[PDB]
Design an enzyme around this catalytic site. Sequence first.
Site, PDB file in Angstrom:
ATOM      1  N   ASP A   3      20.057  19.465  20.153  1.00 33.45           N
ATOM      2  CA  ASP A   3      20.778  19.350  21.261  1.00 33.45           C
ATOM      3  C   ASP A   3      21.505  20.909  21.854  1.00 33.45           C
ATOM      4  O   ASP A   3      21.263  21.665  20.886  1.00 33.45           O
ATOM      5  CB  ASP A   3      22.266  18.619  21.004  1.00 33.45           C
ATOM      6  CG  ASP A   3      23.192  18.982  19.981  1.00 33.45           C
ATOM      7  OD1 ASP A   3      22.475  19.653  18.937  1.00 33.45           O
ATOM      8  OD2 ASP A   3      24.278  18.731  20.190  1.00 33.45           O
ATOM      9  N   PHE A  59      17.138  27.176  21.463  1.00 38.13           N
ATOM     10  CA  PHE A  59      17.281  28.221  20.745  1.00 38.13           C
ATOM     11  C   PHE A  59      17.991  29.346  21.497  1.00 38.13           C
ATOM     12  O   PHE A  59      18.682  30.336  21.166  1.00 38.13           O
ATOM     13  CB  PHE A  59      16.352  28.733  19.760  1.00 38.13           C
ATOM     14  CG  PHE A  59      15.966  27.836  18.674  1.00 38.13           C
ATOM     15  CD1 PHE A  59      16.698  27.643  17.464  1.00 38.13           C
ATOM     16  CD2 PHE A  59      14.768  26.773  18.836  1.00 38.13           C
ATOM     17  CE1 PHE A  59      16.325  26.594  16.441  1.00 38.13           C
ATOM     18  CE2 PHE A  59      14.425  25.914  17.975  1.00 38.13           C
ATOM     19  CZ  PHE A  59      15.433  25.825  16.765  1.00 38.13           C
ATOM     20  N   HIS A 111      14.229  24.080   8.567  1.00 36.80           N
ATOM     21  CA  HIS A 111      15.247  24.494   9.567  1.00 36.80           C
ATOM     22  C   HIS A 111      15.343  25.965   9.536  1.00 36.80           C
ATOM     23  O   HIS A 111      15.457  26.414   8.451  1.00 36.80           O
ATOM     24  CB  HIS A 111      16.439  23.928   9.919  1.00 36.80           C
ATOM     25  CG  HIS A 111      17.155  23.859  11.319  1.00 36.80           C
ATOM     26  ND1 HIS A 111      17.743  25.184  11.504  1.00 36.80           N
ATOM     27  CD2 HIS A 111      16.960  23.137  12.437  1.00 36.80           C
ATOM     28  CE1 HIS A 111      18.121  25.176  12.854  1.00 36.80           C
ATOM     29  NE2 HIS A 111      17.655  24.054  13.174  1.00 36.80           N
ATOM     30  N   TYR A 163      23.475  24.226  22.389  1.00 33.91           N
ATOM     31  CA  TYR A 163      24.519  24.783  22.034  1.00 33.91           C
ATOM     32  C   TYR A 163      25.605  24.211  22.815  1.00 33.91           C
ATOM     33  O   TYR A 163      25.904  24.023  24.055  1.00 33.91           O
ATOM     34  CB  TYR A 163      24.559  26.450  22.293  1.00 33.91           C
ATOM     35  CG  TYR A 163      23.450  27.220  21.548  1.00 33.91           C
ATOM     36  CD1 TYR A 163      23.630  27.472  20.153  1.00 33.91           C
ATOM     37  CD2 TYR A 163      22.539  27.591  22.162  1.00 33.91           C
ATOM     38  CE1 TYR A 163      22.602  28.342  19.534  1.00 33.91           C
ATOM     39  CE2 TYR A 163      21.487  28.381  21.615  1.00 33.91           C
ATOM     40  CZ  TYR A 163      21.359  28.578  20.274  1.00 33.91           C
ATOM     41  OH  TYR A 163      20.343  29.181  19.510  1.00 33.91           O
TER      42      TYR A 163
END
Lengths: 100, 234
Positions: B68, B80, B190, B70
Amino acid sequence: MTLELQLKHYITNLFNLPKDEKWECESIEEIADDILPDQYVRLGALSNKILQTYTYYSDTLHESNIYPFILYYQKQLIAIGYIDENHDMDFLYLHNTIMP
Amino acid sequence: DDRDLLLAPKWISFLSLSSFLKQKLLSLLRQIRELRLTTTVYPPQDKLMWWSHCCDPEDIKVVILGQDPYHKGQATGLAFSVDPQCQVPPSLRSIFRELEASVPNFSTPSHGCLDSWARQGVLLLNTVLTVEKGRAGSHEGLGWDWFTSFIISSISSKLEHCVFLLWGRKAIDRTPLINAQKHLVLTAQHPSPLASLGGRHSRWPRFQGCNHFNLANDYLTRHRRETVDWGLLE
């Protein structure tokens, strides 16, 4: 907000960082198997369970090579701590762990 | 009427949404507008499909899945990426460091705006396109999953010889959508620093040293496609 400010107070006092510096937060969901210590994940029934993670960052936090974090499992607080300069996970708080 | 989908024209053609799915997407967008009336939602409306305006489906080369957006104002519409004025968040910092370590010509930029990647065909697609201010994952149930999964499936089925960089449990959950016989699927943990520590029990390779970007460029060259110049970040 309150827990964030507690973590910020603790970290800034522990590492002598500026108290007024603004912290920003990155939130990422990841299974506990990749985040928390192995035996802790097993004994805590956290295997294959998604943790809501919050990683805090700033200028002095970047210069200090430190990543303060707060880990939740749904609505359960799991961990409060930081990744130190040597890439180790140091815990202020870990659920059902005395002296982590 | 199709322009209300906020997608670029070629993207509307490529996805070829049925009337039912178009109405579903429009209802979700109206939900977002009604929420904006009373709460702050990231990213802005004109940024939900920013990836579709940064490049056309025919230019897609590498697909990088996010979660999702920021939740504190850093979101730009791409996964990102952050605005050129904002600090580089930890996951993007780790991505940049892996690029620095693995790609020779790459030098870590002073900002985190990935629009240059998106223009080169790097689809930075969040799996959930919206989030409420200060509330991570608050739009988990809104219904973005069908749409982003539809985008991934359309890229898988109608395009060929793309690279999918799946990082973390949430991104790897989208593995069944991708035809691994038509596309390269690189899987790793991740990039967050919280997943880079030793003494864990991850099932996927460490992100530091995964070399996903060079491997993606190798795949693209091997199938006579232009590579991604990851170093263009300023």
